[PDB]
Symmetry: none
Subunit: 102 residues, 2 copies
């Protein structure tokens, strides 16, 4: 992960993270990744290893350099604040944002 | 051709993201990932190629065997069925990187 260490002017809109990242050999590339592919809402908490958090979460924001903040519905249907560190699994690979397992 | 599974190993599915470790012509290997949500559609509960966005209406994605995406998806009438699709149809590995083909 650790995309934030090579990237700049990151933004979250709905489920999409977009950033501008330093390419391996120099210069910059801009790319987007749909976080809905890899994050789920488990009882009001954003978690890795699932998908479709956006179905039941709203008001997504980038907090600081690398955190996705949102309000997600608990099983009781109460919106609650939740955050997840995108640096856990999102890498910058030659200036392009990619999900990383290992 | 697709057929990434013959070039790759240690494959996994998390949300809509396929990760796999694929052979490099230099004699090494590269771990990469692809968002299958760009290329797979939920059509009335069945996973199909020639579309996108299946994660919005499916759940419990899993890799079955070496190359099958399995999931539970909502029909147009909003009931869940189990469905599968052979990722080897269109997912290829080119020099250690997963790519969509044709």
């Amino acid at each position: 992960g650790n995309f934030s260490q090579a990237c700049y002017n990151s933004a979250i809109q709905g489920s999409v993270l977009t950033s501008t990242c330093i390419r391996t050999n120099g210069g910059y590339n801009t790319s987007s990744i749909d976080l809905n592919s890899v994050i789920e809402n488990v009882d009001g908490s954003l978690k890795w290893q699932g998908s479709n958090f956006i179905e039941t979460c709203r008001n997504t924001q980038l907090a600081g350099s690398s955190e996705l903040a949102a309000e997600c519905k608990t099983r009781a249907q109460q919106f609650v604040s939740t955050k997840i560190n995108l640096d856990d699994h999102i890498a910058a690979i030659d200036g392009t944002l990619k999900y990383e397992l290992e």
